[PDB]
Nucleic acid binder design. Sequence first.
RNA 1: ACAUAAUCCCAAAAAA
Lengths: 292, 68, 134, 208, 120
Amino acid sequence: XXXXXXXXXXXXXXXXXXXXXXXXXXXXXXXXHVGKTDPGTVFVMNKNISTPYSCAMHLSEWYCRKSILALVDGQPWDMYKPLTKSCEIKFLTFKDDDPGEVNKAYWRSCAMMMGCVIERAFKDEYVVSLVRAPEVPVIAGAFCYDVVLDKRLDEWMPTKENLHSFTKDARALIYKDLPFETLEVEAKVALEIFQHNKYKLDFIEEKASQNPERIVKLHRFGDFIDVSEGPLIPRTSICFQYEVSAVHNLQTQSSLVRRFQGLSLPVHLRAHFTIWNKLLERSRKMVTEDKT
Amino acid sequence: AAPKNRRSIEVNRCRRRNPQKLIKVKNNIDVCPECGHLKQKHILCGYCXXXXXXXXXXXXXXXXXXXX
Amino acid sequence: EIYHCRRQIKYSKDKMWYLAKLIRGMSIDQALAQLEFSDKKGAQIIKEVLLEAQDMAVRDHNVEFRSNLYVAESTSGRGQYLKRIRYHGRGRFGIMEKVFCHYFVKLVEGXXXXXXXXXXXXXXXXXXXXXXXX
Amino acid sequence: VGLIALKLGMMPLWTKDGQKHVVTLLQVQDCHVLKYTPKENHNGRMAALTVGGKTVSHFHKSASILEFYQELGLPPKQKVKIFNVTENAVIKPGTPLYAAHFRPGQYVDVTAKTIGKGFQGVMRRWGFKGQPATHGQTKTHRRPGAISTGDVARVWPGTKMPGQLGNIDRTAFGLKVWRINTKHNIIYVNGSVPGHKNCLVKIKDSKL
Amino acid sequence: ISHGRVFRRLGLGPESRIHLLQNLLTGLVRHERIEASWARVDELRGYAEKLIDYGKLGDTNERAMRMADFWLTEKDLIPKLFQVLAPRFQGQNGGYTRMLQIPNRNEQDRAKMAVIEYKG
RNA sequence: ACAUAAUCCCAAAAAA
Ligand SMILES: [Zn+2]
């Protein structure tokens, strides 16, 4: 499973390098960024596939480190979202009155993150087998990560120490400080990469083919790749803590589905350890609910 | 009283640096909820308030001059 | 590298050195905020020096990203001394020396990296085993 | 045999004999046994006595503290103290307790924090006489005066000099208990107690 | 010793302290908001609440009248205090004399600055 | 039988 993951990561890196090469082949472009977040700001630079986060860096280190999301021409985008021609750049943060976008992005980042973690733990033991299902976001403050496993994992029970170890590895990758990557790829090469995952194949085939856009955004964290229609968390330093609350088993059309669920911590801030235990209980209860 | 001998450099440095801890640096910096300017924690902004306080002082002086 | 200097300004060197060591190794932003909200006579001056250093960095060196600038080195020298007469009792005059401080600031591009972390167990187990083999 | 208490106040009492007795009141808010630590060389085992205010939980934040309260199943507590138990037969596992544990007529020792006087002169500490306030005495009035002798250069260690006084642990001995109230959790103790009211105190079995 | 003692000193004598309180309260009731040192402000709060309560007692009552005449000598402050400022606080109890902090400091003594203001 | 902490220079030992 290590050779297949290394070959898939090498094929994804070659496809990302080829797409990036063919898209950035012309390095002559005009990027004008003008808008008022704080009072007015006017800047003009020449680059292709320009990053608004680099403009945040251009302003100062403070607004840079406090940058979470980027509102462009009224449309909310990730800070890694490339800009072209004239654009109006606004900096959206958690403390702002509109938590929704950064919240959704946060939950989708947490789902992805564990998408990597579980896989890495499953790369520790060759006995286990993992197949990723689609993820279900919940605006109630929940996120559900769906997956299916080998029969051996169906026979063997998920002891508490296990999930604790998953949490430890999650925090490990959290303080490892690994930057997220944003790739623009065709549905074809993507289909080829996701061939080993049936649910993702069905996802792309059914949903993405109906969509007029053949350009899909692949978010890469470590050796893990995920499909996202929306913004991602800026860095690994943004997420202070993570926890694994509980799992569920659903039976549909004579098929079994294993759904893992947990919670996340915004703006690197926790009130106390008591309210943390309370957050554990709340987490598990929200897992028992399984909102849809 | 009077000093017995001249102070060495080492003693002077160790005395003037370590125990005083120079100037301890905490974080007083917070972003203003209104204008987004950087100001001190647990304190009113120095941008969107001082101008409104000067405008309120000019309005109070104009009202006190119009009432008299 | 971007250098900036201020001479023939009258302030206590020992007092200015307090805010001089304060911004040493620190990034431009944090140093700016600090010097802004730091309370002393050197705060304003070193703030001016830093601001001018940033202006020179942007205009002269044409730096692409301002976030890639940090403070690599800061130092305070002593200039000439102005001798004044302090009148004391019983017909005696003491000498009041008015000092001067020459502030020097050296900036280098790139991200700031400073590690003061040192593992005690690793350093001990290494230095002891290397000293016992020498 | 002993428990941790909280200083309430003082008040006179009238015995049927007609003799006046000045006593102090020690209130018991809450008591719980937390940890039991057995020992060998000391020939005695330690127990944990705890009096909580339950309010301090949020404004006092620590990993070990909160994890201790949570893992032990103990409610939020303000003050955690230890007690040395010599007798191994009377030792019990973690249990909540009441102020009925004390009986009238029993002499007890009271360990509390002495009133802090802050920085104090040579007077009020060692109770020196000082110098005269008259007869040509200049600025020597509250001064300690001479210290050492010409023979020995350095001053002897432990020499009495002005400094910080109070805010330290002290144990008063030979304090008789006239009576106890179980329902109101009040202890009547004849004697004086160290520190101001509302300060944490300790009631223990005396030695007679 | 400072044990259990309100009523601070601030380097002023008793008469100087009382007069300071009267002046700061004069400016406070006149301008409805003032700027002073944090200590003087925090000390001024209670006395302000007291004068307000005295205004809440009664207009016709002699106790309140002579109290108000004692603290405030100015003839301009009293009617504006009783007729205007008092009736709006009628429902409030501890709801007057709010204290806030000022961002910067003086260029001389760097004294911490604070502002006191009544609820509009 | 003299007046700050002991042994007449450490610790001990034994009687070429
Ligand atoms: Zn502001």
